[PDB]
Structure formats: structure tokens, C-alpha cells
Amino acid sequence: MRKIIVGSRRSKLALTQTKWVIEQLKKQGLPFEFEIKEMFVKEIEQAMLDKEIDMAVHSMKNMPAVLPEGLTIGCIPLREDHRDALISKNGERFEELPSGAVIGTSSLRRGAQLLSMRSDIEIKWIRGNIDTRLEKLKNEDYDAIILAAAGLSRMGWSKDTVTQYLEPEISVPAVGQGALAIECRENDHELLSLLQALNHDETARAVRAERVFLKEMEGGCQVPIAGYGRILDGGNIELTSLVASPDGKTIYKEHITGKDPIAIGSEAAERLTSQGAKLLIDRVKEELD
Ligand SMILES: *Cc1[nH]c(C)c(CCC(=O)O)c1CC(=O)O
Known part of the structure; x- marks a missing residue:
């Protein structure tokens, strides 16, 4: 009877993650309907406190470090690949990239750790979803890009799309990378119990x-x-x-x-x-x- 309203971002990755969680929760056979409401982090959270929506699925690395009072992370499912992934235009591993190679990433975390390993390469900003950045790699002026292995996985890219999976010894992942967060109200005991089996x-x-x-x-x-x-x-x-x-x-x-x-x-x-x-x-x- 109760229809769980799940708020989600507009992007393809966010809706893919949201549908995955809903399909997972349905395997429990409990009497809940699910319905996505396409809706910024503040907007989602206030809508949840307003009870306009009941839960939201985020990439854990995108969750704010501090949640507002009344909200909680109700479920963290089995972690996907946590690693940063190097994708090189011409297939070179990180130590093989030419001197002065341009690696595309807008993350200071990623770029700073790469520069700490090789200061002879350049880190340059880049934007777009996974599909966009991969196409920019084929044209344009990037010799490689950094992406999250879990993002490539959840978007249906083969593992062999990656030139090199970066181990934490080269690049420590962002906090929560590869993990999902299901945010809900702290007192929604019914939803919290439903989320328990997916945790x-x-x-x-x-x-x-x-x-x-x-x-x-x-x-x-x-x-x-x-x-x-x-x-x-x-x-x-x-x-x-x-x-x-x-x-x-x-x-x-x-x-x-x-x-x-x-x-x-x-x-x-x-x-x-x-x-x-x-x-x-x-x-x-x-x-x-
Ligand atoms: C917090 C965060 N979210 C995303 C999608 C990224 C990567 C951005 C990029 O251009 O690589 C970050 C930063 C991070 O530390 O991964």
C-alpha cells in the first residue's frame, strides 16, 4: 500500500543507480510501491524533511560530510570497485605516458596525487558524463582521463575499457567511492527496516x-x-x-x-x-x- 517516493537527480547515472536500488528492494517482497520523482543536495534533503520524498539514492562520494538533523544514511549496499581508473588515448599506463601528457580531471584529489607521482605531466580540467569524457579523449587535447571504476561499471562499460586501474598506493580514492548512499528520514522506521536487508x-x-x-x-x-x-x-x-x-x-x-x-x-x-x-x-x- 505505502508508495515509497524516491527522489533522484536528472542524470543518466543517478537514475540508473536509483532504478537499481528500487529493483533490489523489490526482491524482498514486502508490500511497498516505489515511484521515482525527478527533482541541489539541499533541495533533495529539504524535500525529504518536508516528506515530499521518502528517500534518495546518491553516490556516497557526493554525499555531504554532514547530514542535516533528522536525516540519516539508511543503507549502504555492497561496495562496487572503489578505484580510480586511467583511460589513455593511446593505451599507455601511467608510468608510460609521455612527458608532458595531459590528464583530464576536474578533481584536485585525483590531480594532486598524480602530480605527486609524476610532476612532469599536466592535469587539466574536463567536464561531462562518462560517455562525453571518453569521446573527448578520442578527439581533442587529452592524453588520458581519470574516471571512477564504479561509474564505468554501473554505466555498462566493459572492464577492458580501462587502461589501468589505479591502486590506492598511486591514488587513494575519494571517501565513499564505489559505494551508494540511501538517504532517508531518521525516524522512518518502516523504510529503515526495508533498507536493512540491502545494507x-x-x-x-x-x-x-x-x-x-x-x-x-x-x-x-x-x-x-x-x-x-x-x-x-x-x-x-x-x-x-x-x-x-x-x-x-x-x-x-x-x-x-x-x-x-x-x-x-x-x-x-x-x-x-x-x-x-x-x-x-x-x-x-x-x-x-
Ligand atoms: C566528489 C567528486 N565527485 C565527482 C564526480 C568527482 C570527480 C570529478 C572529476 O572531474 O574527476 C569528485 C572528486 C573526487 O575526489 O573524485
Whole structure:
């Protein structure tokens, strides 16, 4: 009887993710209707607090570090590929790219880590969805681009479209990359129970440590900040956390393994802030203004 209203972005990726979640939730056979309402992060959240919509599906790396009171992340499904992906026009791996090669990405996080590995290449802004950026790679003045492996996966691109999957040792992923967030109201106990079966605890634990570090550093998509957690055999969370200068010449990196997501994320931020990472972040945020 109850029709769950799911608010979604207009883009092809967002609607693809939203339909995937709805089809997943339907496998539980519980009596709910689902209906997408095409609707900015503030607009979605206020519409959810206004109860105009009941939930929304976002890429976790696009979630704000701080949710407004009354809203929660109700479900984090099994994580897809977390890695950044290099796609080279002429098929060169990162270490094979010619001197001065132009790599297209508008993410300071991605560009700064690449420049920290090779400062003889250039990072240049690029816009468009996956299909657009891939076509720009064939023409134009880019020697390679960086995309999220999970985005390529969810958009039906073959794994062999990627020239090189970047391991965290070369590029620490954005916090939450490869994960989805289902946002809903904190007191919507009915929806929360429905979302429980889709939640993957191991993914949620790791992402929770990433997000605590992101929150305590006041980070976001515009900040060269990165964090990736995974569950080790025995239950320990391993968190790699990184803050980089835009030019790639300053790298704050912290590796922490432990049991508690909040404790690990908190220590990561504390250790990096004491070295000067927070001062770097504030300078980059100022330079954007
Ligand atoms: C937070 C965020 N969201 C997207 C889609 C991106 C990548 C942008 C790009 O041009 O590569 C980011 C930044 C990030 O750290 O991945």
C-alpha cells in the first residue's frame, strides 16, 4: 500500500543507480510501491524533511560530510570497485605516458596525487558524463582521463575499457567511492527496516571510518582529501587517509588499523591535522573563493 517516493537527480547515472536500488528492494517482497520523482543536495534533503520524498539514492562520494538533523544514511549496499581508473588515448599506463601528457580531471584529489607521482605531466580540467569524457579523449587535447571504476561499471562499460586501474598506493580514492548512499528520514522506521536487508555491514563499517575522517577534516569534493577503508580478516578496519596540496608537492598520509570506525577516522584526522593538513585545506578553500 505505502508508495515509497524516491527522489533522484536528472542524470543518466543517478537514475540508473536509483532504478537499481528500487529493483533490489523489490526482491524482498514486502508490500511497498516505489515511484521515482525527478527533482541541489539541499533541495533533495529539504524535500525529504518536508516528506515530499521518502528517500534518495546518491553516490556516497557526493554525499555531504554532514547530514542535516533528522536525516540519516539508511543503507549502504555492497561496495562496487572503489578505484580510480586511467583511460589513455593511446593505451599507455601511467608510468608510460609521455612527458608532458595531459590528464583530464576536474578533481584536485585525483590531480594532486598524480602530480605527486609524476610532476612532469599536466592535469587539466574536463567536464561531462562518462560517455562525453571518453569521446573527448578520442578527439581533442587529452592524453588520458581519470574516471571512477564504479561509474564505468554501473554505466555498462566493459572492464577492458580501462587502461589501468589505479591502486590506492598511486591514488587513494575519494571517501565513499564505489559505494551508494540511501538517504532517508531518521525516524522512518518502516523504510529503515526495508533498507536493512540491502545494507552490507562490511561496506558500511569501512565507509563509516572514511566519513568520520572526512567530517573531522571538513572535507568535500572540492578539497584534495582522500580516504579508503576496508575490512581485514579478523574484523579490523584499515583506513588510508590523505590530504594533498594542489601542486602535488605536499602529501599528508596516514595509515591506521583498528576495530572502531569512529576511533580510526578520528585518529586519522587528529594525526593529519597536527602535521598541518587542516591548514592546507583552509588555504585551498580560500583559494577557491
Ligand atoms: C566528489 C567528486 N565527485 C565527482 C564526480 C568527482 C570527480 C570529478 C572529476 O572531474 O574527476 C569528485 C572528486 C573526487 O575526489 O573524485
